[PDB]
Amino acid sequence: ASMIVVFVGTAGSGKTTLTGEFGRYLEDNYKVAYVNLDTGVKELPYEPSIDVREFVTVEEIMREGYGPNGAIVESYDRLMEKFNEYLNKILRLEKENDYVLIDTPGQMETFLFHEFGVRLMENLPYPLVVYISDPEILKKPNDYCFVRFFALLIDLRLGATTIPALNKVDLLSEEEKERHRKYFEDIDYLTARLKLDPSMQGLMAYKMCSMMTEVLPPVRVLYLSAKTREGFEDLETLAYEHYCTC
Amino acid sequence: ASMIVVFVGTAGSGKTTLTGEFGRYLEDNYKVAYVNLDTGVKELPYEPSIDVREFVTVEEIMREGYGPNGAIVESYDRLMEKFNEYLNKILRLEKENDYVLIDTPGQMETFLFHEFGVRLMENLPYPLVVYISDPEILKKPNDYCFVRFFALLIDLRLGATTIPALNKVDLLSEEEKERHRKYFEDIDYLTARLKLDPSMQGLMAYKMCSMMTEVLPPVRVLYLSAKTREGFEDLETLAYEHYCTC
Ligand SMILES: Nc1nc2c(ncn2[C@@H]2O[C@H](COP(=O)(O)OP(=O)(O)O)[C@@H](O)[C@H]2O)c(=O)[nH]1
Numbered sequence: 001a002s003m004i005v006v007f008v009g010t011a012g013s014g015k016t017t018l019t020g021e022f023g024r025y026l027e028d029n030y031k032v033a034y035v036n037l038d039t040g041v042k043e044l045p046y047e048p049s050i051d052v053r054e055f056v057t058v059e060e061i062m063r064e065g066y067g068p069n070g071a072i073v074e075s076y077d078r079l080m081e082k083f084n085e086y087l088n089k090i091l092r093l094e095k096e097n098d099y100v101l102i103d104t105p106g107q108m109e110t111f112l113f114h115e116f117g118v119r120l121m122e123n124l125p126y127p128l129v130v131y132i133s134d135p136e137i138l139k140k141p142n143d144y145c146f147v148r149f150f151a152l153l154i155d156l157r158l159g160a161t162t163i164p165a166l167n168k169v170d171l172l173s174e175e176e177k178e179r180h181r182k183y184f185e186d187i188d189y190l191t192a193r194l195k196l197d198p199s200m201q202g203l204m205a206y207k208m209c210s211m212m213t214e215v216l217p218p219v220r221v222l223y224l225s226a227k228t229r230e231g232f233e234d235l236e237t238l239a240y241e242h243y244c245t246c
Numbered sequence: 247a248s249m250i251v252v253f254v255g256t257a258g259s260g261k262t263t264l265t266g267e268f269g270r271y272l273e274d275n276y277k278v279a280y281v282n283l284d285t286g287v288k289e290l291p292y293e294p295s296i297d298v299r300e301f302v303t304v305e306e307i308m309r310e311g312y313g314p315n316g317a318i319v320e321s322y323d324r325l326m327e328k329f330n331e332y333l334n335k336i337l338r339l340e341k342e343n344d345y346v347l348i349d350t351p352g353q354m355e356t357f358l359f360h361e362f363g364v365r366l367m368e369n370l371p372y373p374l375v376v377y378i379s380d381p382e383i384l385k386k387p388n389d390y391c392f393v394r395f396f397a398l399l400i401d402l403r404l405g406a407t408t409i410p411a412l413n414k415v416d417l418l419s420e421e422e423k424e425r426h427r428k429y430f431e432d433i434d435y436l437t438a439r440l441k442l443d444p445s446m447q448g449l450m451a452y453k454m455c456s457m458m459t460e461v462l463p464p465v466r467v468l469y470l471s472a473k474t475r476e477g478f479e480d481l482e483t484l485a486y487e488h489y490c491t492c
């Protein structure tokens with residue numbers, strides 16, 4: 001049919017921007033759709049073909065009673081109702097578009113723990129998942145293993161090739177933006193330093209890693225910058241290369 | 247010092263209730279504190295010794311500008327400021343209490359992705375983590391592996407023995423509440439049925455499991471019911487048994 005990319009990434013990871021900034025760069029050579037599944041956001045750098053707000057806004061479920069966490073859960077419980085509609089709504093978008101950029105809710109776990117997100121994922125035609133991570137949590141070894149495991153988690157949960165990605169690599173350094181790569185592209189040295197950590201964690205973080213030594217093909221980490229179109233091109237390849245594979 | 251229990255569990259898992267309902271049952275024989283780290287909730291079945299709201303309410307960061315996901319992130323960015331205070335505030339609670347029940351934010355990933363939650367965890371004296379899961383997502387094999395991996399994730403991220411737990415086992419069946427146990431206490435049959443799934447996922451969900459065959463001690467799943475005090479007693483043992491071990 002055509003390529004679909006789901007941007008999953010925790011609150012404040014700046015994925016929405018990326019979601020928009022990637023599309024406009026893709027509107028130069030490709031026809032682009034824009035699905036927003038987030039029920040709680042103010043603006044959008046983009047014009048959604050599909051918007052969950054038109055049905056329901058967290059802001060609403062507020063002026064009704066619930067608080068934040070409770071509103072969120074109700075929105076996606078009210079969505080699992082306009083579901084089979086809302087689904088098809090994304091397929092009829094497939095065959096009139098080259099890329100289709102899906103923008104999952106800020107509460108990653110919303111999309112991740114509640115049928116609305118999982119199911120929608122089963123119904124999509126081999127979607128690629130780009131797991132945006134914010135580089136300001138990569139400080140110590142575990143953190144690297146932590147983020148990469150979770151990414152695999154997502155892959156597992158959502159059943160869809162999931163790509164680890166660092167965001168906002170502009171606000172990076174020089175060697176820093178390569179230190180990160182030492183704990184990434186290279187999957188061996190990460191485990192190497194984990195073996196050094198004599199602490200309980202270090203034990204199972206280390207033991208955890210070897211998720212490669214055992215089994216589960218390496219995977220390539222994407223470095224991206226919404227603002228300065230960093231690694232944007234590569235997303236495309238991967239997109240195609242995955243779209244091909246499957 | 248004394249026992250501290252952190253309840254982590256995704257939105258709508260009904261942990262806050264459990265957090266309160268467990269304490270009042272513990273107020274019968276133990277002196278109990280009550281820390282609420284959630285900046286976005288309406289009421290609380292309990293009287294917090296500590297409340298993050300007194301500093302800042304999501305509701306506020308709303309009537310200022312931000313929306314849901316943006317408010318949340320700002321609250322915990324404003325907390326990493328009253329941090330070293332707010333910390334100590336929990337230690338001076340240690341040595342005047344038997345149990346101390348910590349109530350993490352609904353957006354699990356808030357507590358999980360942003361320093362406020364991680365750091366606070368390092369500063370606590372061997373806290374036990376009870377990962378509440380809602381049984382209405384356990385439908386197919388993966389789901390079981392999914393929830394148990396994530397639990398281990400949490401353990402890893404937060405560095406603290408993490409206990410998988412199903413919630414609301416009252417709204418359960420008979421054999422259902424034992425089917426669940428087949429995919430749990432028994433860690434072998436879960437992998438057994440995963441090997442049956444000839445799908446891509448089944449491959450790495452199966453491959454994933456063997457997180458025991460390889461290495462990482464079994465762990466016991468808790469069945470809990472806020473309302474009907476189910477498995478409440480066991481929490482205690484574990485609490486003590488862990489408090490002892492370390
Ligand atoms: N410097 C920089 N800032 C970014 C980048 N991506 C997003 N941002 C900032 O973060 C905001 C986007 O947040 P948003 O995408 O809505 O958060 P999320 O969708 O919940 O993950 C933008 O207004 C930008 O100012 C980036 O690559 N570099």
Ligand SMILES: Nc1nc2c(ncn2[C@@H]2O[C@H](COP(=O)(O)OP(=O)(O)O)[C@@H](O)[C@H]2O)c(=O)[nH]1
Pocket residue numbers: 069255256257258259260261262263264351352413414415416417470471472473
């Ligand atoms: N039947 C049943 N309902 C529960 C249980 N625990 C919580 N609830 C319901 O869920 C609500 C609690 O939600 P809450 O704890 O605030 O959600 P969370 O803290 O974000 O995970 C309560 O008002 C109960 O009605 C349980 O064990 N059994």
